[PDB]
Amino acid sequence: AATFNPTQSFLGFNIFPTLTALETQGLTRRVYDGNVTMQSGQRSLSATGGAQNASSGAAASVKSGGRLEINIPSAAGNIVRQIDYGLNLDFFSPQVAPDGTITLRIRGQVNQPATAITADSLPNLIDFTNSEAQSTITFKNGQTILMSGLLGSTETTNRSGVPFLSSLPGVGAAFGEKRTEKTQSQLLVIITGTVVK
Amino acid sequence: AATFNPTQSFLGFNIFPTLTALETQGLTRRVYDGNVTMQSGQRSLSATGGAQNASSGAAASVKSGGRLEINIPSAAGNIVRQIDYGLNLDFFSPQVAPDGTITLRIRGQVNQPATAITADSLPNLIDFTNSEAQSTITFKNGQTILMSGLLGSTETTNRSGVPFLSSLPGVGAAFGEKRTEKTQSQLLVIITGTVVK
Amino acid sequence: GAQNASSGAAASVKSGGRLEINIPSAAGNIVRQIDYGLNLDFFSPQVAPD
Amino acid sequence: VPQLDQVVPQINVQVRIQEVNERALQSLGLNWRATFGGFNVAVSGGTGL
Amino acid sequence: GVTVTPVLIKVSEGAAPGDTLTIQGRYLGNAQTARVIIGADENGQGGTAFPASAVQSWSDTEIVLKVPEGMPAGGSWLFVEVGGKRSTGLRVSVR
Amino acid sequence: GVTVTPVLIKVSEGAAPGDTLTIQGRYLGNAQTARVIIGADENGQGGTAFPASAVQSWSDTEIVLKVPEGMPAGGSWLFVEVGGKRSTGLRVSVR
Amino acid sequence: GVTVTPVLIKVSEGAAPGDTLTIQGRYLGNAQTARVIIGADENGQGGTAFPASAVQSWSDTEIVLKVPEGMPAGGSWLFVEVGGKRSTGLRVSVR
């Protein structure tokens, strides 16, 4: 942004520069290891206290985290729900063969509320950071199998400034800005099991 | 963030530093040990006082904590519920063999309201820190078995500052910030039982 | 009790967030889940002896 | 029964979703105003002469 | 060398001097790498280790022992330490 | 030359010295380009590599090994490093 | 002369030295105008081109190759460059 003034004239040369530079890193880990003991032809349990839960039909379960209780009266049937966050592990239909081969349906889920529940919240819309998987696997007694995996990556790499000068290698940042970001992620769900004599 | 001023000039060198350092630890334990005496073909009890409870179908129970009573009128059927917190232990279908082999369904649950109930609270959404498990186990008279276990871990490890200088080992913290957090957790549910002659 | 677009999938994997929606209505309540981030759904995975 | 109770294959399927976007902008403009005897000329980009 | 926490899933009953004590778990290692500790508290502190001569079998998922003479009778906690790493405990009743 | 991360999908049980250990994956490469590391932690650090003489077969989707003498018993992590690039790990139990 | 981006739709499995690698696409050109590059990264950088003697057939919708000796084993990206223009890539597993 250059201008010319034909009526005045500055004295000498002034440069008035200003520099800015920033660097950052982060690293988040979160690990869960859950055991459940169960039987071959195990059925689900129907207690539910009248509320609806996504793990009602599971033969076995383990949870750790929180739980939202929702009681909304309606003329088409009341909305009475339970939403669980934290860690949820559900096991469905765990048949075992005389060899020791285990067949099983596993869900597994890690989630958190995106923003805290503050007693002024309404149950009409909730945001819930979430990661989930579900499938059926078969393995023999003592083996280890990966049910699901997910690898991610991003990059943004912006740049701005003077035409043809901000794009020069190295000295380009003397004529504008520059910014770059990179992200990585990994999610692994691993299953093993043994027969308990 | 560096600047230059071609019109003035400071006298000498000044450094104006500022240091900050913090360390922290925490450790929470919480333990429950519950007994219940019961029979082999024991059935549930249906009292309920008209309210719905998640332990109505349990052959035996033990509770300690609190209990929310909810009375919401509705045109599709009133919502009349009870939500128990603290410790809840439910036993379902406790058959015992002449050997002394005990088969049993156990739920077990520890939970607390996330924020205190204050008589201005509404029953439409409640937050309830929670941990739970349920499964069927079989063991002989006098043995001990783990029904469920859960091991956790986190880490955050942020870092920020001057490019390439804040990342140097040791002296990196002289050019910016640094932060690290770590968490561990363990949850164990263990069952034993004896025949009472 | 909620409606999700991946209910009929044989296998799934998700990572991102999830919107929970509870709207009472006289024609039937709107109880939905909307997932964002990454959604991968697999339907009907037959494998031949080859 | 021997045919309905056989082992069926177990598989692992991998899906990759890839997305790349690029941008490029280029602006350039002169905006002056001249005053000589009697005349007053202004040239801009929004309005012309 | 040992990074994974061992898990104790089941112990048998009794445990009188001369009886057979069976332990079942997941990452239990070797009899040349690990040891069983009995009489400990909830945190694994205290307690006395079984002698190596008390071991009848030791797989990675099952340990069979013979209870020696001189163990502390009453209730206590049992742990398995594999390569210096402590397992999850179980309560045992020494007769 | 190797840009894609190898994926480990299944390992077998046991792994006592003299037993056969089978690994199944996707981009596992060659026995002349890659190596198997056992005894590592969650991040792949530490651990000891299998000798090249322990390899019975090595396809891009299956590795078959013979467990040598001297591996650390107990639980640990197994990785495959193809062309210097580390795979996703699996937990293995050395007997 | 070449304005349209080639599209790679399918590659076969295996790719061990001496095996046959088949590629199917849309605007794949001529063997005298284009070349196949293997071992590249997600962006097409790096990688080594197949020799012209490795080509068995080359239509505008199918390329058939013989894998030479010396390719980098493991996972990598495969591209076809037609008249200097790069295609969309596919991941290939060199044995």
Coordinates of C-alpha atoms in Angstrom, one line a residue, chain A residues 25-29, chain B residues 154-159 179-182:
Chain A
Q25 CA 3.0 -28.4 19.7
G26 CA 0.5 -30.7 21.4
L27 CA 0.0 -34.3 22.1
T28 CA -3.1 -36.0 23.6
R29 CA -3.3 -39.7 24.6
Chain B
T154 CA -4.3 -39.7 29.6
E155 CA -1.7 -37.1 28.8
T156 CA -1.8 -33.6 27.3
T157 CA 1.8 -32.2 27.0
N158 CA 1.4 -28.8 25.4
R159 CA 4.3 -26.5 24.5
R179 CA 2.9 -28.0 30.3
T180 CA 2.3 -31.6 30.9
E181 CA -0.4 -33.6 32.6
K182 CA -0.9 -37.3 33.3

